[PDB]
Design a protein around this ligand. Structure first.
Ligand code: ZN
Ligand code: ZN
Lengths: 147, 209, 104, 96, 145, 265, 97, 114, 48
RNA sequence: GGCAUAGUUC
DNA sequence: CAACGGGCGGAACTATGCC
DNA sequence: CCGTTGTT
């Protein structure tokens, strides 16, 4: 994992899975696996910091971008069957904080939970106040509007 | 067990008494209604090494319209009834001058015996009933409406009244459980009387074919 | 299951035939002994030897619970109820053991 | 704590699931009844439900109080991942 | 005999007419001793339930004992059965070297690893039969491309 | 509960705890130390053994008895086996079986396998599981007429099984032969005739239709049932049933078989 | 007729489906002829009985005069005639309607 | 119970009967190697098979980040407070939702079930 | 397809295309479905 | 002109 | 018991490739 | 999935 985060020997695309109970390590360099980026939580604090945020918000005339964020080991690509050995948090400033302890061993964090929707379902406003068949119907009818 | 065997024999006898009463033969009320203890007393409460040995239970009874027309109810002692057993029974019927007879079987009959039963149909009429098929009376089940066998005069009158050819009636197979219970041949017509939800009663007719 | 079952039954019968001592010589029943029905052949391979064998057990159970008449009634009720020798033994054993638990 | 006793004719999993679903259904129905009986005489949902035009008290309950349990193939949501529903839950979590 | 045997493990090799018992394939790979085959399959020998589960599969090795006859048995069921025997045995070797588990290897010395991977397949089958691992589902998206 | 036990299939595996095959030629010196006293009291033959252990919970749940198991074994295998059994007094309930090409070990494994999956200690074959719950509907309850003429509803235990064997259940002692019913139309046919199959088919259709609270006029139900059971045998509404009718070839050709029917005619 | 009904309908279900709505017809007659329920009437119960008996003969489903045809008609109209007699009973006519 | 192998051909040893000394011998079908066994029991079949997973639970599960943790169940051996826990996590386990525990202290690996 | 040719004849019987009787009176009473109503018998339930 | 495939509405 | 064959919603509207 | 026809 350290080598993949440094981007030295193992490309960021490669996935590594450890099946702790069955004592197997599986490494995939295959093509066709589907993966999405996730933030990294080290102890209980995101590795993403205000310095990263400022360098990103000065993105113009600064040649600092998503690749320079990935190369810093801040975010990571997680495919589907590597998601089975990870503990995710939906919101940093709400789930990392001290509470009645549910999980204190978070391993990642979501960028924003609204990035689970596709192109046509990202135009519906307040989709969480709707009914799922209605969201599906709008996803269908968004490809027929005239503009 | 001996108790269970006595119980099975008693139930088979009671169902056969009901069958004969339905078929119009002359069975008295006391014969129809026997308690288990009465049957134990009259014909042995011990089957194994006892008086009831699937014999002496044979029933000879005369039809209410003709004492000359009588029927036998034989109890083979063999789990698989054979050609020689059928020949023995036919010999006994011939010597007693009896046309029809019933045969209750322990387990089953060989196909050779069944065909040797079918062959003598105009000479003699014999029917096979399994031991399991008579522990209950299918007629008493609430799903089974009342059946009445119709005479040739009543059939002719019905056909003339509705101007029907017998092809145009509903049918009932000669292997039907109730058809075997009533002993009906092909060409006879049964009448079904059942209550109705929209009329209060409805009489149907079925042709055995 | 029928074809496999029939083949199994026939196989079982044939293995049993092949596992016989080749002549099934039909030895006679055993004569007596205060026991009732002592001439009985009613249970295959049971003997008057076994009847006497059980008598001891009844007499000693009765004697310690505290007579040979009551022993013969216990035997004879068991002998009527019985149909197989291992069951006849099982009844004898069960009575003696459980009545020993009441003699205790 | 293994103190749960099975109901006759049911497995331990079956009786646990039955108790959980019964509790949750009671909660949903009670909240629905509260939402119904807290309406007003000018409410348009009540206007369209009482007259029988379109809608139902369950729809009013889902709008006001509680959407309720989601079921897949008649059972609760299954364990799609290894022993958990989503990567945001610990393993073996049977909470509502 | 079927009732006493219970379960047997068979393998469906590609380009072969019908099924083959697994011990036959392992012997065709060049392993003769039951101890060696069980070293390839059962990794920890202190598992009597696994040993008992694999025993009926080894009871089909009562006849076949050598690589040549095992190859003959495998090659007897080709796409076009041969009229000779050397050609059939060569076809069997060709199938076991070219169409069985191509991803492990295709070189001449790939048997030592094909045996291990086939043993792993059999071991995972035993674990599934013993109720020690969950059966896979085709709708899981980690099992898709 | 007694009838529930009587009507549910149960082989030896449902009650056995464990089994093993030993080698013990000595009747006195027994490899197992538990059986010593009673095996000595009990005591050509073969030196091999078939020792099985019966689970106490399942043994006492079904109200079964070791004498009953032994006599069932004797009925099933005859006197070519030997059987010696302990009693419930001891904590360990033990059964010991010995035999009174054709080698012993392979024969004993077949005896054990048959005796565990074919014994049929109790119950009716093909009847897998039987439930027992009080009714909560006015059609599954018994309703009588009192001596004052009213209708009073009574609650009596009703069973609900899985798997069907109607004739045996009807013939069972202490089972009502009038109201007992199944939901297999072929079974109702082969047991009770054609009129009973018509009535049962109507009841099943009414149940499936009215489960949704919907209403359909009885005339249409009666017409469908009469059409299906007009000719004396069950007529499935398929190509088989449609072409079984002695109608013109042109009506059959338009339904699930055109060329074949036309060429046959 | 009550005993016949109890045989036909066990489990005591009164609800049934029949062609003429007798109670609504009676209500319509009351409103049409301005019947006052607080006063004694001029309807002879013998006239009621005879009228119902004569009416039941004009409701013919199976036409005929043979014993078979008469039996068929009786079976075809049994339930409705039972309902008709129950409703147009003379005591019910004198007290309720 | 277990499988024992001949030292000559390394094949499975089948049981064979010695009809002279009334003794049990394990013999193979490849060579004529004989043996005398101590189990004295050819075959054992338990159908309950309610195996306690404490034999089958690995102590390495304590490194799983996805497992719940508690501090109200101290370890019996080393007295460590935090202890991971989980259910049967196996099929053919009837329906028992009994918990199982593993101590999270390195090299302790105590696996119990209250 | 099963019941496409079942009709009410002028005989008042219900027959298929081969003039085989299905019901001697339609609906066992001879009435039409769209003209009947729910009613109560009012003499079945009351006590003696 | 016809055959096939794809998408969409109810 | 095994192998083989027929059966599987209703309408409607665009487009594109090919003989 | 389940009605025919063959093989045994
Ligand atoms: Zn050897
Ligand atoms: Zn510890």
């Amino acid at each position: 994992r350290k080598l993949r985060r440094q981007m030295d020997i193992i490309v960021s695309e490669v996935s590594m899975i450890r099946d702790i109970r069955e004592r197997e390590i599986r490494i995939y360099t295959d093509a066709g696996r589907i993966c999405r980026p996730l933030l990294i939580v080290e102890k209980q604090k995101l590795l993403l910091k205000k310095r990263h945020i400022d360098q990103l918000k000065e993105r113009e005339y600064n040649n600092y971008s998503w690749q320079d964020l990935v190369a810093s080991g801040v975010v990571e690509y997680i495919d589907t069957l590597e998601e089975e050995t990870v503990m995710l948090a939906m919101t940093p400033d709400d789930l990392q904080e001290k509470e009645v302890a549910y999980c204190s061993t978070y391993t990642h964090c979501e960028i924003h939970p609204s990035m689970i929707l596709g192109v046509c379902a990202s135009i519906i406003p307040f989709p969480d106040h709707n009914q799922s068949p209605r969201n599906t119907y709008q996803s269908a009818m968004g490809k027929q509007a005239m503009g | 067990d001996d108790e269970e065997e006595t119980y099975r024999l008693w139930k088979i006898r009671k169902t056969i008494m009901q069958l004969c009463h339905d078929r119009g033969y002359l069975v008295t009320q006391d014969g129809l209604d026997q308690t288990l203890e009465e049957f134990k007393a009259q014909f042995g409460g011990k089957p194994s090494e006892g008086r009831p040995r699937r014999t002496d239970l044979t029933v000879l009874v005369a039809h209410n319209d003709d004492p000359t027309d009588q029927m036998f109810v034989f109890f083979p002692e063999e789990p698989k009834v054979g050609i020689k057993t059928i020949k023995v029974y036919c010999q006994r019927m011939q010597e007693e001058n009896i046309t029809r007879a019933l045969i209750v079987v322990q387990q089953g009959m060989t196909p050779s015996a069944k065909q040797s039963l079918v062959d003598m149909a105009p000479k003699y009429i014999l029917e096979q009933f399994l031991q399991q098929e008579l522990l209950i009376n299918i007629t008493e089940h609430e799903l089974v409406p009342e059946h009445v066998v119709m005479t040739k005069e009543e059939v002719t009158e019905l056909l003339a009244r509705y101007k029907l050819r017998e092809n145009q009636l509903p049918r009932i197979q000669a292997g039907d459980p109730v058809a075997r219970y009533f002993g009906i041949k092909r060409g006879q017509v049964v009448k079904i009387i059942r209550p109705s939800e929209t009329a209060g009663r409805y009489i149907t007719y079925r042709l055995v074919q | 299951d029928e074809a496999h079952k029939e083949e199994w039954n026939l196989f079982y019968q044939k293995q049993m035939q092949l596992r016989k001592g080749k002549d099934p010589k039909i030895e006679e029943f055993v004569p007596p002994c205060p026991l009732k029905e002592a001439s009985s052949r009613r249970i295959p391979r049971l003997t008057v030897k076994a009847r006497e064998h059980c008598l001891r057990l009844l007499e000693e159970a009765l004697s310690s619970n505290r007579l040979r008449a009551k022993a013969v009634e216990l035997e004879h009720e068991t002998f009527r109820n019985a149909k197989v020798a291992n069951l006849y033994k099982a009844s004898v054993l069960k009575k003696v053991a459980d009545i020993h638990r009441a003699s205790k | 704590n293994n103190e749960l006793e099975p109901t006759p004719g049911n497995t331990l999993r079956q009786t646990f699931e039955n108790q959980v679903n019964r509790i949750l259904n009671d909660a949903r129905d009670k909240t629905g009844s509260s939402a119904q009986k807290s309406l007003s005489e000018y409410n348009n949902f009540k206007s369209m439900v009482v007259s029988g035009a379109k809608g139902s008290k369950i729809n009013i309950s889902q709008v006001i109080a509680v959407v309720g349990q989601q079921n897949v193939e008649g059972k609760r949501i299954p364990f799609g991942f290894k022993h958990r529903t989503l990567p945001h839950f610990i393993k073996d979590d049977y909470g509502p | 005999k079927k009732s006493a045997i219970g379960q047997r493990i068979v393998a469906t090799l590609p380009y072969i007419k019908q099924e083959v018992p697994i011990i036959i394939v392992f012997r065709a790979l060049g392993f003769v001793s039951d101890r060696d085959i069980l070293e390839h399959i059962i990794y920890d020998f202190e598992d009597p339930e696994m040993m008992e589960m694999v025993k009926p599969s080894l009871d089909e090795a009562f006849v076949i004992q050598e690589q040549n006859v095992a190859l003959n048995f495998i090659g007897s069921r080709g796409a076009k059965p041969g009229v000779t025997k050397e050609k059939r045995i060569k076809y069997a070797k060709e199938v076991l070297q070219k169409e069985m588990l191509p991803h492990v290897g295709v070189s001449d010395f790939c048997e030592t690893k094909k045996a291990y991977f086939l043993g792993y397949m059999v071991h995972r089958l035993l674990l599934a039969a013993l109720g020690r691992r969950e059966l896979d589902d085709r709708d899981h998206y980690g099992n898709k491309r | 509960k007694d009838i529930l036990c009587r009507l549910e299939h149960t082989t030896l595996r449902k009650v056995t705890a464990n089994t093993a095959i030993y080698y013990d030629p000595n009747p006195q010196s027994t490899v197992v130390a538990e059986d010593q006293e009673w095996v000595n009291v009990y005591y050509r033959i073969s030196p091999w053994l078939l020792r099985v252990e019966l689970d106490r919970k399942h043994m006492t749940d079904r109200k079964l008895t070791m004498e009953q198991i032994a006599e069932k074994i004797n009925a099933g295998f005859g006197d070519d086996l030997n059987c010696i059994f302990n009693d419930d007094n001891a904590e360990k309930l033990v059964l010991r079986i010995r035999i009174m090409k054709m080698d012993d070990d392979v024969f004993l494994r077949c005896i054990e396998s048959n005796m565990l999956t074919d014994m049929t200690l109790q119950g009716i074959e093909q009847i897998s599981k039987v439930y027992m719950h009080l009714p909560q509907t006015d059609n599954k309850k018994k309703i009588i007429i009192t001596e004052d003429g009213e209708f009073k509803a009574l609650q009596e235990w009703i069973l609900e099984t899985d798997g069907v064997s109607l004739m045996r259940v009807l013939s069972e002692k202490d089972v009502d032969p009038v109201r007992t019913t199944s939901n297999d139309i072929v079974e109702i046919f082969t047991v009770l005739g054609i009129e009973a199959v018509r009535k049962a088919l109507e009841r099943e259709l009414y149940h499936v239709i009215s489960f949704d609270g919907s209403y359909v006029n009885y005339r249409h139900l009666a017409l469908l049932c009469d059409t299906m059971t007009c000719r004396g045998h069950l007529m499935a509404i398929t190509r088989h049933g449609v072409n079984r009718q002695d109608t013109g070839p042109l009506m059959k050709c338009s339904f699930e078989e055109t060329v074949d029917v036309l060429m046959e005619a | 007729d009550r005993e016949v009904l109890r045989v036909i309908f066990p489990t005591g279900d009164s609800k049934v489906v029949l062609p003429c709505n007798l109670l609504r017809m009676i209500w319509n007659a009351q409103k049409i002829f301005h019947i006052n329920p607080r006063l004694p009437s001029d309807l002879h119960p013998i006239k009621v009985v005879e009228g119902v008996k004569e009416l039941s003969k004009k409701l013919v489903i199976v036409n005929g005069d043979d014993p078979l045809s008469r039996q068929a008609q009786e079976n075809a109209t049994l339930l409705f005639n039972i309902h008709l007699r129950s409703t147009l009973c003379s005591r019910r006519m004198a007290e309720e309607f | 119970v277990g499988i024992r192998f001949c030292q000559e051909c390394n094949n499975m040893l089948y049981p064979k009967e010695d009809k002279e000394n009334r003794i049990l011998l394990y013999a193979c079908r490849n060579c004529d190697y004989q043996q005398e066994a101590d189990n004295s029991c050819i075959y054992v079949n338990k159908i309950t098979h309610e195996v306690d997973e404490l034999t089958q639970i690995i102590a390495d599960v304590s490194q799983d980040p996805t497992l719940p943790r508690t501090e109200d169940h101290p370890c019996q051996k080393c007295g460590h407070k935090e202890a991971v826990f989980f259910q049967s996590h196996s099929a053919r386990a009837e329906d028992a939702m009994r918990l199982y525990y593993v101590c999270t202290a390195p090299h302790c690996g105590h696996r119990w079930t209250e | 397809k099963s019941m496409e040719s079942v009709m009410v004849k002028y005989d008042a019987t219900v027959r298929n295309s081969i003039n085989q009787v299905v019901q001697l009176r339609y609906g066992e009473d001879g009435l039409a479905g769209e003209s009947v109503e729910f009613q109560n018998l009012a003499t079945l339930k009351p006590s003696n």
